[PDB]
Amino acid sequence: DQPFAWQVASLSERYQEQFDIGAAVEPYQLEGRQAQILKHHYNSLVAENAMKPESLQPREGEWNWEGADKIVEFARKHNMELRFHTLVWHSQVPEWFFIDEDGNRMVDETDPDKREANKQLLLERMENHIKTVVERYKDDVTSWDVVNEVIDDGGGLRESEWYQITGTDYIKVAFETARKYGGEEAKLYINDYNTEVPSKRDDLYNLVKDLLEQGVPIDGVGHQSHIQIGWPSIEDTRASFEKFTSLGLDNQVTELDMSLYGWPPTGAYTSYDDIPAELLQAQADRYDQLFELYEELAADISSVTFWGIADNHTWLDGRAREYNNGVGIDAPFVFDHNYRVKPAYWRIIDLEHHHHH
Numbered sequence: 001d002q003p004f005a006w007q008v009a010s011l012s013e014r015y016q017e018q019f020d021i022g023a024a025v026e027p028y029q030l031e032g033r034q035a036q037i038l039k040h041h042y043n044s045l046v047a048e049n050a051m052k053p054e055s056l057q058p059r060e061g062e063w064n065w066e067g068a069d070k071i072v073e074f075a076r077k078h079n080m081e082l083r084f085h086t087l088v089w090h091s092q093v094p095e096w097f098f099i100d101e102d103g104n105r106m107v108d109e110t111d112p113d114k115r116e117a118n119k120q121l122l123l124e125r126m127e128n129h130i131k132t133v134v135e136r137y138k139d140d141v142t143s144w145d146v147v148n149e150v151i152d153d154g155g156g157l158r159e160s161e162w163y164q165i166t167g168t169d170y171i172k173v174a175f176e177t178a179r180k181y182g183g184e185e186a187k188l189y190i191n192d193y194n195t196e197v198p199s200k201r202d203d204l205y206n207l208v209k210d211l212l213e214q215g216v217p218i219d220g221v222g223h224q225s226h227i228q229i230g231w232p233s234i235e236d237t238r239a240s241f242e243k244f245t246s247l248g249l250d251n252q253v254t255e256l257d258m259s260l261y262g263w264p265p266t267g268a269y270t271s272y273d274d275i276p277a278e279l280l281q282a283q284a285d286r287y288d289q290l291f292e293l294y295e296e297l298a299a300d301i302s303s304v305t306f307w308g309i310a311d312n313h314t315w316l317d318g319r320a321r322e323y324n325n326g327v328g329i330d331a332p333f334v335f336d337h338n339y340r341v342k343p344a345y346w347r348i349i350d351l352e353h354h355h356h357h
């Protein structure tokens with residue numbers, strides 16, 4: 001019978017002098033056992049949802065700070081670093097950004113001179129969003145996800161509304177604006193998933209390299225690390241970290257979780273007791289090797305953030321349900337759905353160093 005997360009040695013303490021250990025949170029998780037676990041095991045936080053653009057500015061000038069403020073106050077009180085997710089993102093983006101002053105959709109404008117006017121209007125709206133958020137939280141955020149998921153999985157840039165209306169200029173202007181109002185001390189990240197896939201890694205590298213050569217202020221790369229038990233490979237993960245280090249960039253692991261399933265997560269288990277112990281052991285073996293890699297590359301990695309706390313709250317549950325006709329759970333963390341430690345906890349708290357040849 002495994003002990004509860006509040007009864008075992010601290011993860012963040014184990015990784016002192018190597019990297020911070022972070023968790024994604026909701027404001028309603030900052031009480032009770034989840035808050036107890038946060039304070040005991042983590043020294044960095046990120047808002048799972050309360051700081052995304054539609055949460056903060058759902059309508060132009062309608063600012064919703066309360067939930068984000070609660071996370072900031074918790075980080076202040078318990079000496080936790082805070083990442084910011086996220087200033088600019090194509091996902092669930094507030095539609096009002098992309099509507100011109102006549103009420104028409106900018107993406108559909110066919111007149112060239114009007115398209116140029118839309119580009120300037122949209123960039124001003126983006127600048128004002130970044131300015132307002134950075135001015136409020138500058139002294140509380142130590143890593144800014146300035147742009148998120150701007151590379152397409154099929155190659156090249158993601159053809160979101162941001163890209164259709166502004167080209168790459170929204171990326172350039174976002175970093176310049178975050179630097180302007182955050183100051184030279186703000187640490188500015190480009191965040192993405194599947195950064196271990198060589199073709200996507202290379203596209204992100206080529207984009208960031210070109211931007212750096214133009215003077216765009218970029219300090220690091222966020223690797224979301226939504227991974228599986230058998231994918232991606234340790235060697236591809238190593239290759240990706242090193243390539244961005246070669247540009248002088250920090251690496252952060254920003255949204256780590258290890259699904260029990262492939263992609264798509266078909267054939268998900270409908271109850272936690274249906275999970276075979278051998279599957280949690282395989283997860284433990286993989287987490288061991290993953291954090292062994294992180295230790296080897298600790299000079300290149302400033303923080304490792306899990307996209308949640310314990311298995312009772314993860315976006316992977318909704319992903320399982322999406323692909324299994326509305327039913328299904330996932331178990332991606334080192335703490336299980338009752339807050340008891342899993343085999344993976346023991347394998348990343350330990351000091352084992354005998355290799356696995």
Ligand SMILES: [Ca+2]
Pocket residue numbers: 017018019298299300301302303
């Ligand atoms: Ca480090």
Ligand SMILES: [Ca+2]
Pocket residue numbers: 311312313314317329330331332337
């Ligand atoms: Ca779950």
Ligand SMILES: [Ca+2]
Pocket residue numbers: 288291292346347348349350351352
């Ligand atoms: Ca280990």
Ligand code: NI
Pocket residue numbers: 020043081
């Ligand atoms: Ni720190």
Ligand code: NI
Pocket residue numbers: 288289292352353354355356
């Ligand atoms: Ni090992």
